[PDB]
Amino acid sequence: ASEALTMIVNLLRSQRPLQEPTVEQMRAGLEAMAQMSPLPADVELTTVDAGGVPGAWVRVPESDPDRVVLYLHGGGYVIGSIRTHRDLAQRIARAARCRVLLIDYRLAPEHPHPAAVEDSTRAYRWLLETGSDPKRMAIAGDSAGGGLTVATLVALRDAGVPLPAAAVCLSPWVDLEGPLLRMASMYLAGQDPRTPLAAPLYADLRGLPPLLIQVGTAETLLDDSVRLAERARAAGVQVTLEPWEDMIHVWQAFAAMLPEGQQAIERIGEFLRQHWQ
Numbered sequence: 440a441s442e443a444l445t446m447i448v449n450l451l452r453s454q455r456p457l458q459e460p461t462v463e464q465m466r467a468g469l470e471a472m473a474q475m476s477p478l479p480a481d482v483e484l485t486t487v488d489a490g491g492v493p494g495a496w497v498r499v500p501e502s503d504p505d506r507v508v509l510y511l512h513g514g515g516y517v518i519g520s521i522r523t524h525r526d527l528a529q530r531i532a533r534a535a536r537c538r539v540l541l542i543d544y545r546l547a548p549e550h551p552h553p554a555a556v557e558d559s560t561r562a563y564r565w566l567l568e569t570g571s572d573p574k575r576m577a578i579a580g581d582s583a584g585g586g587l588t589v590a591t592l593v594a595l596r597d598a599g600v601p602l603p604a605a606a607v608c609l610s611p612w613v614d615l616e617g618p619l620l621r622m623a624s625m626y627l628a629g630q631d632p633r634t635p636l637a638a639p640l641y642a643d644l645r646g647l648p649p650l651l652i653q654v655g656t657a658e659t660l661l662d663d664s665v666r667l668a669e670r671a672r673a674a675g676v677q678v679t680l681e682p683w684e685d686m687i688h689v690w691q692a693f694a695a696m697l698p699e700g701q702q703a704i705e706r707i708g709e710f711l712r713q714h715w716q
């Protein structure tokens with residue numbers, strides 16, 4: 440609805456994806472677009488070994504150090520890094536007044552399912568080991584990271600690990616079968632595309648903590664979020680589904696230039712601070 444949206448949409452077209460790019464071109468591409476994004480000078484970054492998963496603490500002046508979001512970046516389980524999602528991480532840290540742990544979870548096709556879930560559960564387990572309180576923790580992720588957020592909560596529940604206070608899905612990708620089909624292939628490596636921890640639309644969602652789903656009405660993954668909300672609510676999960684009118688896929692990533700992007704992130708901050716008390 441804002442004019443900034445039309446400017447974002449034109450920019451995404453202007454980066455014409457005509458030739459089908461290799462995985463390496465896609466990684467280097469996304470890594471370059473992210474280095475052009477300025478990181479505010481009050482953002483403190485600390486690299487860490489999160490129990491055998493490489494990670495980075497994102498901290499800002501107003502971060503409460505006892506509140507933690509484990510943030511799982513999207514990129515079709517193929518693309519993305521601790522560098523590509525630092526701006527989203529630093530904005531969630533401000534709005535939610537918390538530390539964010541970004542993790543460099545193993546990517547396909549080099550490391551197929553269930554490697555991503557093994558890394559996300561391990562990093563969560565490591566936060567507990569090192570003194571983080573589940574009632575002051577959340578898991579959040581965008582697109583593939585949004586599906587991995589759900590897969591992680593299921594895998595943790597099934598292993599008897601204490602679940603966090605809340606979770607946040609930004610335009611989650613939870614149905615691997617329906618561009619993203621090829622990234623689905625690379626993640627699955629022959630496995631059934633309704634594998635519960637790969638496609639958590641088929642997972643048992645009972646006992647998950649309060650779940651915020653932010654999705655745009657102008658995105659092909661609208662139905663993933665709607666079906667997720669239905670399955671979660673049928674399983675007795677406290678779901679908040681926010682469909683944002685006319686918003687595109689992970690519009691929150693454009694928060695620097697899109698008022699709806701910064702508004703969505705302030706809402707993420709509110710949801711988290713509400714469930715932390």
Ligand SMILES: O=C(O)c1ccccc1C1c2ccc(O)cc2Oc2cc(O)ccc21
Pocket residue numbers: 451465469512513514515518519581582584687688689690692
């Ligand atoms: O969607 C993608 O796979 C992709 C591919 C190349 C560059 C950037 C992206 C996007 C992207 C990658 C990772 C991620 O976690 C989120 C993400 O979000 C978007 C959103 C867009 O509207 C527009 C594009 C992307």
Ligand SMILES: O=C(O)c1ccccc1C1c2ccc(O)cc2Oc2cc(O)ccc21
Pocket residue numbers: 595596597599600601602603646647
């Ligand atoms: O959330 C948990 O800590 C958890 C994790 C795995 C299995 C069961 C639980 C729950 C749980 C564990 C111990 C306990 O003393 C209370 C408890 O309560 C709940 C309540 C839920 O809504 C949903 C889940 C749990």
